[model samples]
Target: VFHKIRNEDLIFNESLGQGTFTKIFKGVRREVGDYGQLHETEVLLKVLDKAHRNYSESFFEAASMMSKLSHKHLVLNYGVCVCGDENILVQEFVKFGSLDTYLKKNKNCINILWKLEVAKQLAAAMHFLEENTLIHGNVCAKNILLIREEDRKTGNPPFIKLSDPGISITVLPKDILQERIPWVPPECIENPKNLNLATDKWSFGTTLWEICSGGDKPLSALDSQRKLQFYEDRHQLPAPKAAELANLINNCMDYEPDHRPSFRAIIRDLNSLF
Candidate 1:
């Protein structure tokens, strides 16, 4: 435990989600009504425990970095509480949860339209970050949130919000010696500082694989040595069952990082598909 939030003014509800080192709770502010009743405004309270040392700095960095970002596809950071041993970040609650859960529930009907919509939204968000010369650092189904159309006042098809930026570094480095399980690009594992926009493009390509395959884990079934060897030998991605948009995904996961298409190119190609 970090520090106890004892103020009755802040109501912390049940756990919303759990990560390696932190637990997220639905929170709300207590407000007094004119008639003396209590009212509450929704928020998310992220509590990080000290035992998870590796994740502590990354969490703090994400809160600090995101506090400065004001994009529609990024989660909104409300505030932070850094009193004493406790470090809590307050942010807008993503009511729709994560893309992983959403895809699981709708996997049966994940048609071309749905896949293209997700790709477009994801591309737009990535393009926005790339335009600012900022790398998302972590892009995966679990880190992407899809807000339902009905939940939006404008009734637009649910779009994606890129979350958990820079969190990957908490577990793995850019070099293969320290690569995270699945998302690390092969070249990045070879050279950490070599990481740049191209490495991000590689990850984006894998993410596109997830979107098209109805949230399947890319290259996860392969053993570690086999996986590394496959990348080394320029092995192709298994054909997606539906074959709707597999070629684009294959292009993104090209063996050479430089061969991967830019986000701008992806957006243009995806726009035609949609």
Candidate 2:
């Protein structure tokens, strides 16, 4: 509902990542146009699925709500592009890309201290969103973006930037969720439409597991939802190598939604360290 850009102006480059009904591309806009500060710098283009009629409404609604949000931990949103049939969210482009990519490549290189800092940063961002009555539709490692890649020799990670916060699940009802079952809270799976504070806690817990385990898959990479249910129902997640961290995860992934801890509480726990 804001800036109007021509399709020709959006110059696409490498693919950043993709959501359920959105494809993300790293690109820059033509400098010949102006209004805001953005002139020729790189940006992220989140284009909605062209095939879905309902997506247009959802995309606009989320974008309108997100335009008002400005936080340190979250990525800076320049604006939304709604020219022609295109509906792309123009966002700040981070060079290092998603945290999941970094973990898979250099999880071993990252020290435990850095991991704790990363978790705390994420918690702060989530707390801000919660205060505003907003839920992060996607809360997996992949959605997390590092400020920049750190030198393995120094082993100091700057911080994490949470990208694409609102309306995470942008797809048809029959489509599978963007992340695996473990990353999503159990109650969320039961009712995807009603994602809120409690469900986000479960996602935060799973994301913590990924960070602590050095990108290890949750519950032995349990693929089947039915089997995942049985284990969760019986309170049988895999034991943690570290007892203290284990307790935190258990509290986060509690079967009862009411039992889960808040993001603020999670930040305190991370601050304490083991």
Candidate 3:
């Protein structure tokens, strides 16, 4: 069972960001006890917008699963708290922040070798997800967190951990799920109703593009929702750099999901760079 913390145990620091149904905050767990004890450390609290039924179910579903998963490349979920008006997910604090934010800020200085390493880490996480019959739902630079060691160098992120695995866009009616649009596959774009596991491969391809080409920028950045529809319209993703790397990215975005390689295979391709 996962730990549950009381609101009193968490000291809010500031808002990290917010979504249609989620508000992420940097907070400190100053104390804990009984069945709700947590380490004395700062954490990211993912607070769900309880007013939206869709987000409420998805939020809790993601938390329940994240609580049991522990992998080198997976972000750690500490616990959950619902002692207040909002449901909160306690998560590890990755000081370097999201991969997209970090890469965008340091793209000019980041080497090709570093990007390959980032690819490898994410591939491993996806491999694990496949074996578990679970999907990351979204795997992009924005969902990957960098964990630097003692040195804490911005330009040199020692490792990357997958965040927001199994969590999709912060959804709600009369709202824009903008964060998910760019990473979404064609089938998903055409039919926003259901997202299948194969779409994960498509997202991975786009994520690979963002990582190699500098982060935070969309795969197309065409700014038209119709452009995201291009894939379903039979247009392939524009190529990224590195001949072999680009080939792999293209395969991941294959119009036919069955043509895409498994995450384990993706790791092999990334390793070839070394």
Candidate 4:
């Protein structure tokens, strides 16, 4: 069971950014140990908007599901802070922000081998989600957070931890759902709510394209929804320079969802590459 974090114990430091339904902040959470000593942990506080209908209901539901999951590549959900209209989700804080910015800022230091490490770990995380019977409707570069090694000079790749895992579709606003179109599968493009495990595989493909291409925007040439639909109609995706990686991406974006390989199959293929 997840314990309620008192508002007084949380010290909001800097505003991180915004989410579909919450304002993110980098904060410090303080709690007393058994010896009456205080322990402080750096955490990201996602404060949900109370204005949304049934905010508490969906917030607690998503938080409960996240609390049950434990994985190295999955971001940890510490607990929730409930006070009046204030509902805050405490999550693991990673200093490197997210994969999009991390790759963009450190392009010179990153290479194909390093990118492969990221791709492999993310595939493993997806496999874990599928094993738990969870569908990660939202799979994009922003959702992939990076955990940088303390000593970057050592040339170690930053670890990957996926965030916003398995959030309820009912809580997503129409605009936010539209914003995910680039990474959304063909089936869900027409009806964004139509999501399943197979759709996630399609999303993973586009995200893989992003990683392999140094965080470049997917389908950058396409602008309108009509154009996007036309492109998918032809079963097309931006090809990465890496031959094996490009092949995997195309397989993930198969026109028929059934043709797409399971994350289990994907992980096996990724393992053999390295």
Identify the leading candidate in terms of TM-score: 4
Please write out the lDDT profile of model 1 over residues 1-274, one tens digit for every residue: 1223344556788997776467788989665657998767687777787666567667767556654667888877666666656667776778777787777778896667777888888888888878877766667787787766323356456677887563445354334333343566777666655667777777787777777777778777777777777767877777778676678877877768879888899899888765
Query: Which of 1 and 2 is ahead in TM-score?
Result: 2
Q: How well is each residue in 172-206 modelled by candidate 2, as lDDT tens digits?
A: 36236523577666666666765777878888877
Candidate 3 ranges with C-alpha deviation above 4 Å: 32-39, 50-54, 149-157, 166-179, 192-194, 241-244
Name the candidate, 1 or 4, with the larger TM-score value: 4
lDDT score, candidate 2, position 105: 85
If both were scored by TM-score, which would come out higher, candidate 3 or candidate 4? 4
TM-score of each prediction: 0.82, 0.85, 0.86, 0.88
TM-score of 1: 0.82
When summed lDDT is taken over every stretch of 10 residues in candidate 4, the lowest stretch is: 165-174
- In candidate 3, list every pair of residues with a backbone clash: 136-166
TM-score of 2: 0.85
Candidate 1 minimal-lDDT segment of 10 residues = 170-179
Q: Rate the local accuracy (lDDT) of all candidates.
A: 0.71, 0.72, 0.73, 0.77
Between candidates 2 and 4, the one scoring higher on TM-score is 4
Each candidate: RMSD: 4.4, 3.2, 3.6, 2.6
When sorted by lDDT, best at the front, the candidate numbers are: 4, 3, 2, 1
- Scored against the true structure, residue 237 in model 1 reaches a CA lDDT of 74
